[PDB]
Design a protein around this ligand. Structure first.
Ligand SMILES: Nc1ncnc2c1ncn2[C@@H]1O[C@H](COP(=O)(O)OP(=O)(O)O)[C@@H](O)[C@H]1O
Ligand SMILES: [Mg+2]
Lengths: 70, 371, 70
């Protein structure tokens, strides 16, 4: 009588195990994508501040040359 | 016939036929021996495990590196590594294949002499040649000028080349490399509470360094951020479970390249050595050297290394000059690609060292015009 | 006997179900972070070219002013 219950429990355990394994696999996939995106955006943010400083002292010496031309 | 390109390197042996796009076989240059006794009878385990085979049996074996800093210390296990590479990974008899090798700048002449003697006697290759890693790396990038930095696991060196003309007097070689970074990471992880002593766990620390470490553009600001925020910690899973966390050590380890004082080295950082090597050259070629800065080697693969290096060099160099750093995605395989391209050239066919030529001229011929 | 194993299996299944729920929660959080980073990088890499052309013509009339001053 309990054999059918054990078989059903085993089938359910296998089903939830497969679903869980897919859940991790997707979790590592999404996490790797997120970390790669975060590293890329952080690097290009650092690029953003460096080009911002570049631009700033660009108008600095541009203005200086402007009064020099004056 | 076809030529064979072998790159012994240090910590990773990469080899393959000339003309291929990528090396066929890549495996760590590790030879191991079992330190235990073994009770099962009939197993018939062999004395020595080499290559990637020893990596899978890490917990039972002990790992010995035949190459410390470019140079080779133990020669019998080096012969074992070469025999494995020639016979198992490539499955080709070296009796009918010329072999091209890579050799770091500023190494003892006895190294080259014994290398050629072993390759001509033990394996009886019809011909062979030895080339500098930096020149091959410059071949791979498609450039013809520019200063190239080759930071591998054994040694870091800069070779300034202009219009195909090397400048030997401006070559700077530094012993800081990936192995020292791994050792410093081992020394620094003890602070958090994790202790690694066995040579097997050296590989685990190396994997942590490869997969987790990164270079910070600014050091003091990152320290201030990490002292308050907790957004920098990441978790790593050891082979037997037991997840660990890591904070400042994530970016403190690669800072040793720019701050050699961390491990007690007297010399200056790579950013300063590159500028010094550029300034050691002439004055009419500094524009192209500044504008064609080439990176290579496995240790260069740290994320954010290019931005920090460019910032430092710009802070050093005059503001008028344009500073550009070339960081191809395939940095660590650049040397082998350059070697394949060099061995595939038609004009290179008459620069090999022949068998009878070596026999009549002796092993000393390597240092002659056939460099 | 079999009852102990069944009870342990049920408890483990409940634990892995809770882990599954946490996994989907973490996946959703990672997806939200990924799309926010995508928006941020989109803004940044459509402003980088504006900054680049800005510094370009900045140095352009810097050079013009310098030659006129000479
Ligand atoms: N992505 C990476 N992160 C950290 N270290 C790396 C990375 N890629 C390669 N390395 C380092 O480079 C070393 C191998 O250098 P490699 O390019 O194979 O030349 P060689 O074999 O001559 O040292 C390894 O010890 C490894 O620590
Ligand atoms: Mg190398």
């Amino acid at each position: 009588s309990l054999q059918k219950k054990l078989k059903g429990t085993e089938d359910e355990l296998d089903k939830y195990s497969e679903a869980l394994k897919d859940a991790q696999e997707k979790l590592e996939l999404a996490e790797k994508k997120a970390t790669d995106a975060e590293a890329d955006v952080a690097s290009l943010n650092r690029r953003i501040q460096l080009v911002e400083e570049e631009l700033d002292r660009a108008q600095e010496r541009l203005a200086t040359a402007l009064q020099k031309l004056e | 016939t076809t030529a064979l390109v072998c790159d012994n390197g240090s910590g990773l042996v990469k080899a393959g036929f000339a003309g291929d796009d990528a090396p066929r076989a890549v495996f760590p240059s590790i030879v191991g021996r079992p330190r235990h006794q073994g009770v099962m009878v009939g197993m018939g385990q062999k004395d020595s495990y080499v290559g990637d085979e020893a990596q899978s049996k890490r917990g039972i074996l002990t790992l010995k590196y035949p190459i410390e800093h470019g140079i080779i210390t133990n020669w019998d296990d080096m012969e074992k590594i070469w025999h494995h590479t020639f016979y198992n990974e490539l499955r080709v008899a070296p009796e009918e294949h010329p072999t091209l090798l890579t050799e770091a700048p500023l190494n003892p002449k006895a190294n080259r002499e014994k290398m050629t003697q072993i390759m001509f006697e033990t394996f009886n290759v019809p011909a062979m040649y030895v080339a500098i890693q930096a020149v091959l790396s410059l071949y791979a990038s498609g450039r013809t000028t520019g200063i190239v930095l080759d930071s591998g696991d054994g040694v870091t060196h800069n070779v300034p080349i202009y219009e195909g003309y090397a400048l030997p007097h401006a070559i700077m070689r530094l012993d800081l490399a990936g192995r020292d970074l791994t050792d410093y990471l081992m020394k620094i992880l003890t602070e958090r509470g994790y202790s690694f002593v066995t040579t097997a766990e050296r590989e685990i620390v190396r994997d942590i360094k490869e997969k987790l470490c990164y270079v910070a553009l600014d050091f003091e600001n990152e320290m201030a951020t990490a002292a308050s925020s907790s957004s920098l910690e990441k978790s790593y899973e050891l082979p037997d479970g037991q997840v660990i966390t890591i904070g400042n050590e994530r970016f403190r380890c690669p800072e040793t390249l720019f701050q050699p004082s961390f491990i007690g080295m007297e010399s200056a950082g790579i950013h300063e050595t590159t500028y010094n090597s550029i300034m050691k050259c002439d004055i009419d070629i500094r524009k192209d050297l500044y504008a064609n800065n080439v990176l290579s080697g496995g240790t260069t693969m740290y994320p954010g290394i290019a931005d920090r290096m460019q910032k430092e060099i710009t802070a050093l160099a005059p503001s008028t000059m344009k500073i550009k750093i070339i960081a191809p995605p395939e940095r660590k395989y650049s040397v082998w690609i350059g070697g394949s391209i060099l061995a595939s050239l038609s004009t290179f066919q008459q620069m090999w060292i022949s068998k009878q030529e070596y026999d009549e001229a002796g092993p000393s011929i390597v240092h002659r015009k056939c460099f």
